[PDB]
């Protein structure tokens, strides 16, 4: 039986199931597939892996010699084996190091989460259908006249201003299973906005499955800028760039989730919260640009900033973009997901 899912629906569906965008990217991040292949990718290899790094975080910051610390090294690499030819393995010395292999294994966890629910499970169903309903997901295409599809045009139009233009392909309401009712206490909360979130096409059917997610407490939490909560921005320049598309392949994926912040905690660089202080349900980096605040508009209760960028008054500010963190899960309520095209061009700046 063939699905009688929209084609746009479908090919979402084998995109983000898509098995040889997960090999490619272990490959890119140098693991030796022979040793540790998509299938025996697991959660406690995964968050022991954490727990290393976490470790090493510690022995920088407690003098360790350097034998203590190329033997947590070691274990790392032996954890999760790396194929680096002829070249050393990089030791995992500062916190530089550990900051870039605890973004990968952020970026792997969801590759196994994918790889599982691929797996899992059964025919006489089309296998388009029987993966879309794994998702536990409600997608439904947005009409591209419709007003809603206007205003996220104009979100991403106004919000873009860095080698690329941006082209939205698809728009997807989506509405996980059991979402609205966790999100429920927070509708409550004041100050919810509509903000961006972008990732890894090879995240995405973690994300529609389970959610966007806290790194877990074996993750070292200086792997974190602003510490272990839920990311995203205001302007769709900042999200985009998490989508890693190329030449090769310039289609990427990007959400747009509704965030109960409350009171914001304002910060102009880095703190590697665990705990919000009292009073306070969020965090924002300041950045030296925001969207044009007379140019908000409210799609269905929600705050929409997609006022063309202007500039702050932030001074002495490492962000360029304004950021918003939440430490509770239950804070966002995704709604839509973004199809983009990216259309690589360069352009001298003015
Ligand atoms: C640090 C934070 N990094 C991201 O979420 C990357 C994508 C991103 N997208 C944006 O649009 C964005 C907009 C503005 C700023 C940052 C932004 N970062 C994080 C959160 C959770 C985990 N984690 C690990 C295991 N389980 C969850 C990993 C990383």
């Given at each position: 039986?063939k ?8 090919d ?10 997960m ?9 030796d597939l022979?040793k ?8 406690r ?14 022995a ?19 954890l ?6 002829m070249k ?15 973004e ?14 691929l797996?899992?499970?059964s025919?006489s ?6 993966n879309?309903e794994?998702?536990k997901?409600?997608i439904k ?10 205003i ?8 873009h ?6 082209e939205?392909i698809?728009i ?7 979402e ?6 927070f509708?409550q909360?004041?100050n919810?906005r ?9 995240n ?17 939490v200086?792997?974190?800028?602003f510490?272990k ?29 509704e965030?109960?912040?409350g009171?914001?905690?304002?910060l ?15 965090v924002?980096g ?17 705050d ?5 960028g202007?500039?702050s ?8 973009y ?8 239950a ?19 003015h």
């Amino acid at each position: 039986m063939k699905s009688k899912l929209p084609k746009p629906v479908q090919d979402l569906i084998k995109m983000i199931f898509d098995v040889e965008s997960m090999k490619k990217a272990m490959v890119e991040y140098e693991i030796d597939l022979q040793k540790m292949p998509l299938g025996k990718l697991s959660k406690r290899q995964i968050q022991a892996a954490y727990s290393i790094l976490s470790e090493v975080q510690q022995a920088v910051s407690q003098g360790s010699s350097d034998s203590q610390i190329l033997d947590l090294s070691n274990r790392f690499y032996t954890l999760i084996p790396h194929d680096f030819g002829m070249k050393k393995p990089p030791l995992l010395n500062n916190a530089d190091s550990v900051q870039a292999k605890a973004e990968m294994l952020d970026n792997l966890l969801d590759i196994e989460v994918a790889y599982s629910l691929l797996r899992g499970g059964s025919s006489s169903k089309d296998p388009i259908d029987v993966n879309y309903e794994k998702l536990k997901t409600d997608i439904k295409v947005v009409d591209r006249d419709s007003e809603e599809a206007e205003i996220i045009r104009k979100y991403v139009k106004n919000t873009h201003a860095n080698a690329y233009d941006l082209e939205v392909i698809d728009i997807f309401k989506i509405e996980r299973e059991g979402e609205c009712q966790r999100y429920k206490p927070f509708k409550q909360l004041h100050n919810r906005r509509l903000l961006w979130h972008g990732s890894r096409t090879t995240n995405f059917a973690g994300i529609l499955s389970q959610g966007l997610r806290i790194a877990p407490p074996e993750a070292p939490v200086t792997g974190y800028m602003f510490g272990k909560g839920i990311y995203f921005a205001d302007m769709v320049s900042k999200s985009a760039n998490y989508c890693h598309t190329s030449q090769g392949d310039p289609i990427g994926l990007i959400l747009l989730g509704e965030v109960a912040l409350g009171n914001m905690y304002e910060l102009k660089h880095a703190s590697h919260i665990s705990k919000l202080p009292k009073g306070k349900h969020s965090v924002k980096g300041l950045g030296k640009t925001t969207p044009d605040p007379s140019a908000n508009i409210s799609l269905d209760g929600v705050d929409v900033p997609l006022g063309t960028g202007i500039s702050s008054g932030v001074n002495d500010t490492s962000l360029l973009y304004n950021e918003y963190i939440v430490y509770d899960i239950a804070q966002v309520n995704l709604k839509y997901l973004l199809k983009l095209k990216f259309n690589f061009k360069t352009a001298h700046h003015h």
